[PDB]
Coordinates of C-alpha atoms in Angstrom, one line a residue:
Chain A
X1 CA 36.3 4.4 31.9
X2 CA 34.5 1.7 29.9
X3 CA 31.6 3.5 28.2
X4 CA 33.4 3.0 24.9
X5 CA 34.1 -0.6 24.0
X6 CA 36.0 -0.9 20.8
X7 CA 34.4 -3.7 18.8
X8 CA 37.2 -6.1 17.8
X9 CA 35.1 -8.7 16.0
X10 CA 31.8 -8.0 14.3
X11 CA 28.7 -10.1 14.8
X12 CA 28.9 -11.6 11.4
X13 CA 32.0 -13.8 10.6
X14 CA 34.0 -13.6 7.3
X15 CA 32.4 -16.9 6.4
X16 CA 28.9 -15.3 6.9
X17 CA 30.0 -11.9 5.7
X18 CA 28.0 -12.1 2.4
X19 CA 25.4 -14.8 3.3
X20 CA 23.7 -11.9 5.1
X21 CA 24.5 -9.0 2.7
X22 CA 21.3 -9.8 0.8
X23 CA 19.5 -12.2 3.1
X24 CA 17.6 -9.3 4.7
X25 CA 16.1 -11.2 7.7
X26 CA 19.3 -12.1 9.5
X27 CA 18.6 -11.2 13.1
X28 CA 21.5 -11.6 15.4
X29 CA 20.9 -13.5 18.6
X30 CA 22.4 -14.1 22.0
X31 CA 25.6 -16.1 22.2
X32 CA 25.4 -17.9 25.5
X33 CA 29.1 -18.7 25.1
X34 CA 29.9 -15.0 25.0
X35 CA 26.7 -13.2 26.0
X36 CA 27.5 -11.2 22.9
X37 CA 25.3 -10.7 19.8
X38 CA 26.6 -12.8 16.9
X39 CA 24.9 -14.3 13.9
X40 CA 24.3 -18.0 13.4
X41 CA 24.1 -20.2 10.3
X42 CA 20.7 -21.3 11.7
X43 CA 19.0 -18.1 10.7
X44 CA 20.6 -17.1 7.3
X45 CA 18.7 -17.3 4.1
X46 CA 16.3 -19.3 6.3
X47 CA 13.2 -19.3 4.2
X48 CA 11.6 -19.9 7.6
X49 CA 11.5 -16.1 7.6
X50 CA 12.9 -15.0 4.2
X51 CA 9.2 -14.8 3.2
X52 CA 7.7 -14.2 6.7
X53 CA 8.5 -10.4 6.2
Chain B
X1 CA 16.2 2.4 -11.3
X2 CA 18.5 1.7 -8.4
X3 CA 21.2 3.5 -6.5
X4 CA 22.7 2.9 -3.2
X5 CA 25.7 3.1 -0.8
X6 CA 26.8 0.7 1.8
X7 CA 29.4 0.0 4.6
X8 CA 30.3 -2.5 7.2
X9 CA 30.1 -0.4 10.4
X10 CA 31.3 2.8 12.1
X11 CA 34.1 4.8 10.5
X12 CA 36.5 2.2 11.6
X13 CA 39.1 1.7 8.8
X14 CA 39.0 3.6 5.5
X15 CA 41.4 2.0 3.0
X16 CA 39.7 -1.4 2.4
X17 CA 36.4 -2.2 0.8
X18 CA 34.1 -5.1 1.2
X19 CA 30.7 -6.8 1.0
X20 CA 28.7 -3.7 1.7
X21 CA 26.8 -3.6 -1.5
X22 CA 25.9 -7.3 -1.7
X23 CA 22.9 -6.2 0.4
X24 CA 21.4 -4.8 -2.9
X25 CA 20.7 -8.5 -3.5
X26 CA 19.1 -9.3 -0.1
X27 CA 16.4 -11.8 -0.6
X28 CA 15.0 -14.7 1.3
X29 CA 15.3 -17.8 -0.9
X30 CA 13.8 -19.8 2.0
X31 CA 11.1 -21.2 -0.3
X32 CA 11.1 -20.4 -4.0
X33 CA 8.6 -23.1 -5.1
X34 CA 5.5 -21.1 -5.0
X35 CA 6.3 -18.2 -7.3
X36 CA 6.0 -14.6 -6.1
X37 CA 3.3 -13.3 -8.4
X38 CA 4.4 -9.7 -7.8
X39 CA 7.0 -10.2 -10.5
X40 CA 4.4 -11.0 -13.1
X41 CA 3.2 -7.6 -14.4
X42 CA -0.2 -8.9 -15.3
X43 CA -0.9 -9.7 -11.7
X44 CA 0.3 -6.2 -10.9
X45 CA -1.9 -4.7 -13.6
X46 CA -5.1 -6.3 -12.5
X47 CA -4.6 -5.0 -8.9
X48 CA -4.2 -1.5 -10.4
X49 CA -7.3 -1.3 -12.7
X50 CA -9.1 -2.9 -9.8
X51 CA -8.4 0.0 -7.4
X52 CA -8.9 2.4 -10.3
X53 CA -12.5 1.4 -10.2
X54 CA -12.4 2.0 -6.4
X55 CA -10.6 5.3 -7.2
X56 CA -13.3 5.9 -9.8
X57 CA -16.5 5.0 -8.0
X58 CA -15.0 7.0 -5.0
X59 CA -15.3 10.4 -6.6
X60 CA -18.8 10.1 -7.8
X61 CA -19.9 9.1 -4.3
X62 CA -17.9 12.2 -3.2
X63 CA -18.8 14.7 -5.9
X64 CA -22.5 13.8 -5.5
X65 CA -22.0 14.7 -1.8
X66 CA -20.8 18.2 -2.7
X67 CA -24.3 18.7 -4.1
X68 CA -26.2 18.0 -0.8
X69 CA -23.4 19.9 1.0
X70 CA -21.7 22.6 -1.0
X71 CA -25.0 24.6 -1.7
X72 CA -26.8 23.6 1.5
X73 CA -23.9 25.3 3.4
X74 CA -23.5 28.6 1.7
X75 CA -25.2 31.1 -0.4
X76 CA -24.7 30.5 -4.1
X77 CA -21.1 31.7 -3.6
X78 CA -20.9 28.1 -4.8
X79 CA -18.5 27.2 -7.6
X80 CA -15.8 29.2 -5.8
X81 CA -16.4 26.6 -3.1
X82 CA -16.9 23.6 -5.5
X83 CA -13.8 24.6 -7.4
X84 CA -12.2 24.7 -4.0
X85 CA -13.3 21.1 -3.2
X86 CA -14.1 19.6 -6.6
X87 CA -10.6 20.5 -7.8
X88 CA -9.3 18.9 -4.6
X89 CA -11.5 15.9 -5.3
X90 CA -10.2 15.5 -8.8
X91 CA -6.7 16.0 -7.3
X92 CA -7.2 13.7 -4.3
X93 CA -8.6 11.2 -6.7
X94 CA -5.4 11.6 -8.7
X95 CA -3.0 11.1 -5.8
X96 CA -5.2 8.3 -4.5
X97 CA -4.2 6.6 -7.8
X98 CA -0.5 7.4 -8.2
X99 CA -0.2 5.7 -4.9
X100 CA -1.6 2.6 -6.4
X101 CA 1.0 2.7 -9.1
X102 CA 3.9 2.6 -6.7
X103 CA 2.3 -0.2 -4.9
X104 CA 2.0 -2.1 -8.2
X105 CA 4.4 -0.5 -10.6
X106 CA 7.5 0.8 -8.8
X107 CA 7.5 0.2 -5.1
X108 CA 6.1 -3.3 -5.1
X109 CA 9.2 -4.9 -3.7
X110 CA 10.5 -2.7 -0.9
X111 CA 8.0 -4.5 1.3
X112 CA 9.0 -7.9 0.2
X113 CA 12.1 -9.8 1.4
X114 CA 12.0 -12.5 -1.2
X115 CA 12.6 -9.9 -3.9
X116 CA 15.8 -8.0 -3.7
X117 CA 15.7 -4.4 -4.9
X118 CA 17.6 -5.3 -8.0
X119 CA 15.1 -7.7 -9.5
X120 CA 12.5 -5.2 -8.5
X121 CA 14.6 -2.4 -9.9
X122 CA 14.3 -4.2 -13.2
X123 CA 11.3 -6.4 -13.1
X124 CA 9.3 -3.2 -12.9
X125 CA 10.1 -3.0 -16.6
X126 CA 9.7 -6.7 -17.3
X127 CA 13.4 -7.1 -17.2
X128 CA 15.4 -9.8 -15.5
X129 CA 18.8 -10.0 -13.9
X130 CA 19.8 -11.9 -17.0
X131 CA 19.6 -8.5 -18.9
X132 CA 22.2 -6.7 -16.8
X133 CA 24.4 -6.6 -19.8
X134 CA 27.3 -4.8 -18.3
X135 CA 29.0 -3.4 -15.2
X136 CA 31.3 -0.4 -15.1
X137 CA 34.0 -0.8 -12.5
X138 CA 35.7 1.4 -10.1
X139 CA 38.6 -0.1 -11.8
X140 CA 41.4 1.5 -9.9
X141 CA 44.2 -0.9 -10.6
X142 CA 44.7 -2.1 -7.0
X143 CA 45.5 -5.6 -5.9
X144 CA 42.2 -5.7 -4.0
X145 CA 39.5 -3.5 -5.6
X146 CA 39.7 -5.2 -8.9
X147 CA 39.8 -8.4 -6.9
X148 CA 36.9 -7.6 -4.5
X149 CA 35.0 -5.5 -7.0
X150 CA 34.7 -8.7 -8.9
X151 CA 34.0 -11.3 -6.4
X152 CA 30.9 -9.6 -5.1
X153 CA 29.5 -9.3 -8.7
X154 CA 29.8 -13.1 -8.8
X155 CA 27.6 -13.6 -5.7
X156 CA 25.0 -11.1 -6.5
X157 CA 24.6 -13.0 -9.7
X158 CA 25.4 -16.3 -7.9
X159 CA 22.5 -15.4 -5.7
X160 CA 19.9 -13.9 -8.1
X161 CA 20.0 -16.7 -10.6
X162 CA 22.0 -15.3 -13.4
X163 CA 22.1 -18.0 -16.1
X164 CA 25.4 -19.7 -16.2
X165 CA 26.8 -18.3 -19.3
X166 CA 25.4 -14.8 -18.9
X167 CA 28.5 -13.0 -17.7
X168 CA 28.6 -9.2 -17.4
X169 CA 31.2 -7.3 -19.2
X170 CA 33.9 -5.5 -17.3
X171 CA 34.2 -1.9 -18.4
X172 CA 37.2 -0.1 -16.9
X173 CA 37.0 3.6 -17.9
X174 CA 40.1 4.4 -15.9
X175 CA 42.9 3.2 -18.0
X176 CA 42.4 6.4 -20.0
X177 CA 41.8 8.9 -17.3
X178 CA 43.0 7.9 -13.9
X179 CA 41.3 8.1 -10.6
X180 CA 39.4 11.4 -10.2
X181 CA 39.1 10.7 -6.5
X182 CA 35.5 11.8 -6.2
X183 CA 34.6 12.3 -9.8
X184 CA 34.7 8.6 -10.9
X185 CA 31.1 7.7 -10.5
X186 CA 30.1 10.2 -13.2
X187 CA 32.9 9.4 -15.7
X188 CA 31.5 5.9 -15.4
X189 CA 27.9 7.0 -15.1
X190 CA 28.4 9.1 -18.2
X191 CA 29.9 6.2 -20.2
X192 CA 26.9 4.1 -19.3
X193 CA 24.7 6.4 -21.3
Chain C
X1 CA -11.8 3.9 7.3
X2 CA -13.5 4.2 3.9
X3 CA -10.6 2.7 2.0
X4 CA -10.0 0.3 4.9
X5 CA -13.3 -1.4 3.9
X6 CA -11.9 -1.4 0.4
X7 CA -8.7 -2.8 1.8
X8 CA -10.8 -5.2 3.8
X9 CA -13.3 -6.5 1.2
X10 CA -10.4 -6.7 -1.2
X11 CA -8.6 -9.6 0.6
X12 CA -11.7 -11.8 1.0
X13 CA -12.3 -11.4 -2.8
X14 CA -8.6 -12.4 -3.1
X15 CA -8.2 -15.1 -0.5
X16 CA -11.4 -16.7 -1.8
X17 CA -9.7 -16.8 -5.2
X18 CA -6.7 -18.7 -3.8
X19 CA -9.2 -21.5 -3.2
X20 CA -10.3 -22.0 -6.8
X21 CA -6.7 -21.4 -7.8
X22 CA -4.1 -22.6 -5.2
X23 CA -5.3 -26.2 -5.2
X24 CA -6.6 -26.4 -8.8
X25 CA -3.0 -25.6 -9.9
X26 CA -0.8 -28.0 -7.8
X27 CA -0.9 -31.2 -5.9
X28 CA -1.8 -30.7 -2.2
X29 CA 1.7 -29.2 -1.9
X30 CA -0.7 -26.5 -1.0
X31 CA -0.2 -24.5 2.2
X32 CA 3.4 -24.0 1.2
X33 CA 1.8 -22.2 -1.7
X34 CA -1.0 -20.6 0.3
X35 CA 1.5 -19.4 2.9
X36 CA 3.5 -18.1 -0.1
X37 CA 0.6 -16.1 -1.4
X38 CA -1.7 -15.8 1.6
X39 CA 1.1 -14.3 3.6
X40 CA 1.7 -12.0 0.6
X41 CA -2.0 -11.2 0.6
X42 CA -2.1 -10.3 4.3
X43 CA 1.1 -8.3 3.6
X44 CA -0.1 -6.6 0.4
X45 CA -3.3 -5.8 2.2
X46 CA -1.1 -4.2 4.9
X47 CA 1.0 -2.1 2.6
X48 CA -2.2 -1.3 0.6

């Protein structure tokens, strides 16, 4: 009985809440700490990609 | 020019708002040195007249072909066929243009990360974020809405380069009326006009 | 395929123009500009 797994914390964090909201190339990634999918400041308004698309 | 809706995630908790709309300002500031010419109309104009030629030379190379084709096929039951294809040509040639517009006049920013829809919602008319004179507010008189309906505005101007000293003027059409639950957006979309 | 040619010959006539333009404008802070427009070209060519 574990098909449904209530999210308790979103991928973004309240500190990054809006740093994504109009940085449209924020791809979440693997969190080797958790195995979960959570954003990182290393890929947010990163003009590395913000033009690549 | 722009309209949208937004939300964190699944129907999870109703009574609290948040960032959701800030995504109407998504753009990749990763490198802003080399200007994005797409915002300069002139650039967008040349591309257009350019293809127009292409759209123009295209028909002649096509209508000429109905000659060797549209009467070599049938009897002289001909202009009923020409009109059936010529019309189409003149039409296809049309639609084959008004697609160029939206690449160059309206929908020239959807497929660009480094231009949020909002600049492109306005740059399409030669406007700028610095001309968003006003902002009509949900303005409910809650501790948060008025508090969070106002933060966001800051960012989306803190993020699009609104000139320090170009605030936008809080209109609150609700002190008169109330909260029409689902009617608000009009009352405040009426005012606007 | 017809317009593809048009979409194809279009870039070359455009990328060639970044030559006479993208280094006549600036210093050799160049491929940061090219990449800013070339990318766009390859992209505009796509959407086109």
